[PDB]
Design a protein around this ligand. Structure first.
Ligand code: HEM
Ligand code: HEM
Lengths: 722, 726
C-alpha cells in the first residue's frame, strides 16, 4: 500500500471550502447529489478500487513497468501487445478542439420553472413548476485554444443543455446581449480576424492585434459588441458573476399555435462582477485556470452557481415597433422598453467525473429546439443552424455523437437512421425505412398537439425574391454602442477608454488605429477624444462635427447595461487572504474567521513559507499558501491581523501583496500594528483599520466586500508603483 | 482599394528590427532567402494579389457579405452553396494537437558540416563540407496545449528535420541531456501525471500539482530530469539561448561497418541564458507568445539562430567503462569524461508562410534515420520508434502524411505503397508489388554500400530471454542529480531550491511534499534542508544521516552542466527598453541608440501613451509601446535618458517598470536627472554594482551597460531584492 496510513490522500466526501481538501471527481466528492441525467450516466461510469489492472481486452497485467525485450538490456519485441495497446491509446488521445469556444469549463445541475408557461409555450420543460429538468452547462472564452488562459479579455460563452422529456434543448448563448456580426456568411471572416494571425499564430487569447482592428474598422456593425468586450464585461470575476443571453430573437409557440417573440436571459443570483484589466492580464500568468478552478471549487464548497432564466417577450404585432430590427443580432432590446420576466431557476451542483469524457466531448447546438419553441429569420441564427451539426462530424468523429454518454437524451429516441462510425445502438427493427408494413410502420410519426406532439414549424409568411442582400433596417451601427456607453458609470467609462487604448497601442499599423478612432467619433466624442489622446492622435474638424447617433426609442441610457450602477453584490463564496505573522494575535483571528464564516466567505491563511505558525496563545495555524504562491489576484480582499508585525513588515512579498490589492481596488483591513503597512503602500479609500479586529472592523470589511471594489480609489491609483 | 495610399500596410522586404514593421509570411519578408526545400515548396505556395475571390471549385464570388435568402429579411436557403462551402471549411479547420509538445514554434534553415566525417559515418549529409542540407526546426514545450504559454517551467523540445539526399533524418531532442523515465512503457503514466489532472483538466503548462509530485516521489528515476526542470534550465530566455540534446545513445556506422556510439548535442552560438521564475510566470500572462515572437522577430531582423552540432563519441569496446549504463536515458555523459566534438553548423534564416500548413502539420520522428546511423537498445528510444509513426495516423489523418508539403523529402521516393486517405501521388507503375516481372522489378532494392546504398541494420549481438525486466544497471537514481547540483553556481542552487519550494507549495496533500523532501535527502542534504525549511518540514535524524551517492567516475562537478559558471554571453539580438519623457535630451538618445545599434542590440522606445514625443532639438521620436504595454519582462535591460524627468517621475508605471527590472536582476542605466529614480529602487547615493549612472549617456556609460548585458543578469544583487515590494 502506497497510500498514507492517516488517509490524508482522500478528500472528504462532503462540502469543503476552496483549498481545504484536494479536488475530486464529482461522483466521489458528492455521491449523494443526483438528477435523472447523472443517474442515466451510471451505466458508463467506471470505478477502480479493488480492481486488477488490465488491457482493454480484459487481460490482467503482471508488470506495468517494463517493455518485453530479448534480455534485460535488449531490444523491445514486436510481440509486446500490452506495450503497443498502452502506447497506441496514448498516441490517439487527442481530438480536434472546438473551432471557437475551445476553452471551457462545465458542470451538472438542474432547472425548474417558477410557474407554468402553458399560456405562451407548449414546451414541456416550462409546463409545470414541479417539472425538474437536468442540465449540463459549459462556460467558455471564444478566441483561445483549449490550453489558453481563462481571464483573457474576450466574450464568454454560456451554453446550457436541457435534458427535457420531449427532447434536448440547447440554449447556446454568450455573456453579452448582441454579437459582432449580422450575417453568418461573415462568421469565418470575423473569427479569422480575431484569431491568431495566419503566418505566425500570434496572439493567443487576445484581440489586441492588427487583423482584428482592421476588420472592426472596415465593418462598423462590430462596434456594439466591441464596446461590450472593451468594457469590464470582457473580464468577468467568475462565471458565477456574469449575465447570459441567447442574443437572437426566437419564438415561443403555444398549444393554440400563437407565436410570441422571445429573447433569453440568465441573471446571476451571485450578482454581476468583473476584474480590472491589469489584474486580469496578470492572472492569465499566475493562474491561467482561475475561472475553471473557481467554478469547480464553488461547487465543491456548496456555493452552487445559480441563475434565473428570464424572457423578454414581444407580441408578433409589435415586430416593427422599435427603432431597430428585432432580427438584427447586433442590436439589444433595452430592458426599459421590454422588461425581463422571471421564468425559473438553474442550479449547478455537481462537477463532472472526467473532464474529457463529459466536458470536452459535449456537443451543444442552437438548432436543438423542442416543440413549443421555434426560430426566426435572424440571418446570424439562420447560418448557425447549419454549422453546429456540421462541425460535430469531424470534432466528434462521426454522426453518432449523440451516443456519446454526455450528449444522450434522457427521453426516448427511435428512428430509421443506421450505421455511421462508432455506432453504439443495435437496432432490432426489421425495417430501416418508412413507410413500412413489415414493422407496422413503427416508429411512427406523431401529429403536433398540446403535449407530447410532433414538431411542426410555425407557418411564417415568406415573400420576396431570392437575394443575398442585407436588410436596410440593419444598416445602423452607432446608436446601440452609444446607448451602452451612456449607461456606464464614470469608472466603467474610464475602463472602456483604457481597453480601447491598450488594444490599439498593440496595433502596429498606425492607420488602423486612426480608422478605429474615426469609428469612435461616430459613437461619442468624449470616448473618441479620450482614446485619441492616449494614442497621440488629434481629431479633425470633420470628426469633431460628426452628429451623434439617434437615441434608442427615446432612451438616453438604460442602467441595466451597467455592471455596477445598481448594486447587486453578494459576498457568499468570495475569498479573503489573511496575512499571517509568526506570533498572530489569536483574539484577532478568532473574530475574523467567525465573522467570515457567518457570511459564507472563505479565507486563505498565507505566510512566507508553508507548514505551520503558532499564535500568541499556542494555537497552531496551518498555512494554505505563500504570499508569492497565492497572490492578491486570486482573492477578493485582504486582512492583516496584529501580532509580531516586525516578522513581515520588511517582507517585500507581503508589502507588494497589499500594494497590488490596493491598485486593484480590493478592500484591505489592518488591525493594530498592521496599520504600519499604510505607509509602505504610499498612503485612503476602503482601508478598514482599528486597534483590534472585532464586530465593527469585520462589519466594515464585509460592507466593502458587498460593494465588490473600492471605485472611489481610482483617481490616484495611476501614480502607485505596483 | 482599402489599403492606405502611403503603402504603410505592407512590411519592407528587408531585415528590420523587432517592432519596426508588421511581421509577415517568410517568402514575402525575405524572398531572396532560399534553399532546396524552400524552392521545392513553390509548387504549393498560393498568392492572392490581383486574384478574384472564388469558391474552392474556382467559381467567382460576387457578394461575400451575405447569405442567400427569400427576401432581404427572409430565411437562408439550403441552395446557398457558397455559404455552405465557406462555413463547412471553417467548421472543419481543426486537427488534433500533438499528444505532447503541442505548443511549438518553427523555422526553416540549413546545415553544413565542418569536415567530412566519412571515417566514422557513411551518412551522406555528413560526408562533405560543401554539402548543404536544408532543415526545418520546431522548438516546443512538453505539457501544455497548442494555446498554452511559452515561458512556462517545462522541458523544451528541439526537433530538426534534415532533408538529406539519402532520406529525411529527424533529430528529435530536448533542451536537457536526459529524460524523466527509463522505459517507454511508462511514458503514458509519466505524461498523464504531469498533464492536467483528469477530473477537472487543471493545471495548464505546470508540473506544480499533486499527481506529478506523487509520480516523482514513487519513481526516483525521474529525479535527474526533475533537477534540470527545477533549475533555470526550465525557463529559457529564448529558444536561441538553450542547449539541445538527442538524449539517447545512438550509433554511427561507417563504410567498413564499424559502429561508434554517439550522443547528439546542439550548442547555441548566442550562449546559454534563462529567465528568473517570477519573471517567467508573469511573462506567461503578459506575453504567452514570447518565445514564438522572439524567434520570428530574430529571423526577420537577421539575428539568425545558430547552433553547432556536436557529438560525444564512445568506441564500442568502451560500452561498460562508465559508472552508469550508456543505454540509460536518465543518465548523462559528463563532458569531462567524453568531450563534445564539433561537427557542423545550423542556421535558421526564414520563417514559414503559414503556421498551420508548415508548423502544425510538420511530423518529426526519431525513427527517421538514414544509412550511416543506427539505434541502440535504450528502452525509451525503442518504444519511441513505435509511437511517432502511430500518432501521425490520427493527427494527420492517414498514412500519406509524408505527402503534406512540409514533410516531403527533397530526394527521390518510390515504392509499392498505394492508396490511403488523401492520396496525392498518382502511381503509373504497372506493378504495386515486388518481386515483379511486369515492370522489370522496378523500383529496385539497393545493396548496402559506402554511398547511395540501401539501409542495413548493424548486426548487434542479442542474448537473453524474452523479459519485462529493468536492467539492474539502471537502478541508480541519485548520483547524476548530485553531480548536476554540485555543478551549479550558488545563485543557480538557490534558484533550484526556490523551484522545488514553489512547486511543492502547490501540492495539496502534505505527505507528497514530505516524500519528495525524503528523495532530496538522498541527493544532497543542503538542498533537502533548504527546501524543507521553506515547506515548514523538519528532516528526521535518519534523513540527516543518509550517505550521499557516489561520484560519477571520480567527478564531483562538471561546469558544462551550469548555465552561467563559464561566461558565454552574447548581446546581439537582445533588447533594451528606453523610457522616454516629453522633452528628451537628444544628445543622450543619439549616443544610446548608436551604441546599441553597433552591438546588434535592439531598442524599444516607451512612453505613457502612443504616438510621438519631440526631443529638446525638435527630433520627432516615435513611440513603440506604453510602459504597461511592453513591461520590463520583455526586455533585457532598461535605460532612462535625461530630459524633463518631472514628466515621468510620478508615473506609477514608469516607477514600477524599474522596480520589476531591478527584482529580475536586469541591468539599469540612469543618465542625468534620471538618477532621481534611484530612490524607487533604494539605491544609495554612492551607487551600486549593476546600476549604471552618469551626468550624461557618454562613451563609458554605454560600455558599462553593454558589459552588464553580456553578463546577462546582476547575480550580486540577489541579497538586495527581498526588501523590494514588486
Ligand atoms: C450569437 C452568436 C453566437 C453565440 C452566442 C455563439 C456561442 C457559442 C458557444 C457558447 C459555443 C461553445 C459551446 C460549447 O461547445 O460549450 C459555440 C461554438 C461554436 N459556434 Fe457559435 N456562437 C455564435 C455564433 C456562431 C456562428 C454565427 C457560427 C457559424 C455560423 C458559429 C459556429 C460555431 C461552431 C462551429 C462552434 C463549435 C460548435 C462545436 O464544435 O460544438 N457560432 N458558439
Ligand atoms: C528521450 C526523450 C524524448 C525526446 C527528446 C522526445 C522529444 C520530442 C519532441 C521534440 C517532440 C516534438 C516533435 C514535433 O515538434 O513534432 C516530441 C513529440 C512526441 N513525442 Fe517525444 N520525446 C521523448 C520521449 C518520448 C516517448 C517515450 C514517447 C512515447 C513513445 C514520445 C512520444 C512522442 C509523441 C507521441 C509525440 C508527438 C507525436 C507527434 O510528433 O506527432 N516521446 N517528442
Amino acid at each position: 500500500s502506497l497510500a498514507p496510513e492517516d488517509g490524508s490522500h482522500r478528500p472528504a466526501a462532503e462540502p469543503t471550502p476552496p483549498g481545504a481538501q484536494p479536488t475530486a471527481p464529482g461522483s466521489l466528492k458528492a455521491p449523494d447529489t443526483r438528477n435523472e441525467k447523472l443517474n442515466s450516466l451510471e451505466d458508463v461510469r467506471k470505478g477502480s478500487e479493488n480492481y486488477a489492472l488490465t488491457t482493454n481486452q480484459g487481460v490482467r497485467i503482471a508488470d506495468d513497468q517494463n517493455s518485453l525485450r530479448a534480455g534485460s538490456r535488449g531490444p523491445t519485441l514486436l510481440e509486446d501487445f500490452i506495450l503497443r495497446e498502452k502506447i497506441t491509446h496514448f498516441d490517439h488521445e487527442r481530438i480536434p478542439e472546438r473551432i471557437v469556444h475551445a476553452r471551457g469549463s462545465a458542470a451538472h445541475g438542474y432547472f425548474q420553472p417558477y410557474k407554468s408557461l402553458s399560456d405562451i409555450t407548449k414546451a414541456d420543460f416550462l409546463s409545470d413548476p414541479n417539472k425538474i429538468t437536468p442540465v449540463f452547462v459549459r462556460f467558455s472564452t471564444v478566441q483561445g485554444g483549449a490550453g489558453s488562459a481563462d481571464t483573457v479579455r474576450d466574450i464568454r460563452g454560456f451554453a446550457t443543455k436541457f435534458y427535457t422529456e420531449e427532447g434536448i434543448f440547447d440554449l447556446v448563448g454568450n455573456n453579452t446581449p448582441i454579437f459582432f456580426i449580422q450575417d453568418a456568411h461573415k462568421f469565418p471572416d470575423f473569427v479569422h480576424a480575431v484569431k491568431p494571425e495566419p503566418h505566425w499564430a500570434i496572439p493567443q487569447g487576445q484581440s489586441a492585434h492588427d487583423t482584428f482592428w482592421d476588420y472592426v474598422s472596415l465593418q462598423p456593425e462590430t462596434l456594439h459588441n466591441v464596446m461590450w468586450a472593451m468594457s469590464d464585461r470582457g473580464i468577468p470575476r467568475s462565471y458565477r458573476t456574469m449575465e447570459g443571453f441567447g442574443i437572437h430573437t426566437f419564438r415561443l409557440i403555444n398549444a393554440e399555435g400563437k407565436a410570441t417573440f422571445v429573447r433569453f436571459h440568465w441573471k446571476p443570483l451571485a450578482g454581476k462582477a468583473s476584474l480590472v484589466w491589469d489584474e486580469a492580464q496578470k492572472l492569465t500568468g499566475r493562474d491561467p485556470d482561475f475561472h475553471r478552478r473557481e467554478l469547480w471549487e464553488a461547487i465543491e464548497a456548496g456555493d452552487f452557481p445559480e441563475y434565473e432564466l428570464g424572457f423578454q417577450l414581444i407580441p408578433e404585432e409589435d415586430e416593427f415597433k422599435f427603432d431597430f430590427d428585432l432580427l438584427d443580432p447586433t442590436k439589444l432590446i433595452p430592458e426599459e422598453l421590454v422588461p425581463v420576466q422571471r421564468v425559473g431557476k438553474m442550479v449547478l451542483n455537481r462537477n463532472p467525473d472526467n473532464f474529457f469524457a463529459e466536458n470536452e466531448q459535449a456537443a451543444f447546438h442552437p438548432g436543438h429546439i423542442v416543440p413549443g419553441l421555434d426560430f426566426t429569420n435572424d440571418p446570424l441564427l439562420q447560418g448557425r443552424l447549419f454549422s453546429y451539426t456540421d462541425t460535430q462530424i469531424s470534432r466528434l468523429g462521426g454522426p453518432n455523437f449523440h451516443e456519446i454518454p454526455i450528449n444522450r437524451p434522457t427521453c426516448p429516441y427511435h428512428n430509421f437512421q443506421r450505421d455511421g462510425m462508432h455506432r453504439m445502438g443495435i437496432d432490432t427493427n426489421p425495417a430501416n425505412y418508412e413507410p413500412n408494413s413489415i414493422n407496422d410502420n413503427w416508429p411512427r410519426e406523431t401529429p403536433p398537439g398540446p403535449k407530447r406532439g410532433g414538431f411542426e414549424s410555425y407557418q411564417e409568411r415568406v415573400e420576396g425574391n431570392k437575394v443575398r442582400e442585407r436588410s436596410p433596417s440593419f444598416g445602423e451601427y452607432y446608436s446601440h454602442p452609444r446607448l451602452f456607453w451612456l449607461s456606464q458609470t464614470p469608472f466603467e467609462q474610464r475602463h472602456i477608454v483604457d481597453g480601447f487604448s491598450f488594444e490599439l497601442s498593440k496595433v502596429v499599423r498606425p492607420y488602423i488605429r486612426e480608422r478605429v478612432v474615426d469609428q469612435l467619433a461616430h459613437i461619442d466624442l468624449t470616448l473618441a477624444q479620450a482614446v485619441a489622446k492616449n494614442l497621440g492622435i488629434e481629431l479633425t474638424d470633420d470628426q469633431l462635427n460628426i452628429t451623434p447617433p439617434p437615441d434608442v426609442n427615446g432612451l438616453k441610457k438604460d442602467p441595466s447595461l451597467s455592471l455596477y450602477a445598481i448594486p447587486d453584490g453578494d459576498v457568499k463564496g468570495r475569498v479573503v487572504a489573511i496575512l499571517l505573522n509568526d506570533e498572530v494575535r489569536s483574539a484577532d483571528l478568532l473574530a475574523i474567521l467567525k465573522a467570515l464564516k457567518a457570511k459564507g466567505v472563505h479565507a486563505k491563511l498565507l505566510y512566507s513559507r508553508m507548514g505551520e505558525v503558532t499564535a500568541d496563545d499556542g494555537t497552531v495555524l496551518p498555512i494554505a499558501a505563500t504570499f508569492a504562491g497565492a497572490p492578491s489576484l486570486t482573492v477578493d480582499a485582504v486582512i492583516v491581523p496584529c501580532g509580531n508585525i516586525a516578522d513581515i513588515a520588511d517582507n517585500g512579498d507581503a508589502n507588494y501583496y497589499l500594494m497590488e490589492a490596493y491598485k486593484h481596488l480590493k478592500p484591505i483591513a489592518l488591525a493594530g500594528d498592521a496599520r504600519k503597512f499604510k505607509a509602505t503602500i504610499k498612503i485612503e479609500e476602503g482601508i478598514v483599520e482599528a486597534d483590534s479586529a472585532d464586530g465593527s472592523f469585520m462589519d466594515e470589511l464585509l460592507t466593502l466586500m458587498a460593494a465588490h471594489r473600492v471605485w472611489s480609489r481610482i483617481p490616484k491609483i495611476d501614480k502607485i508603483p505596483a
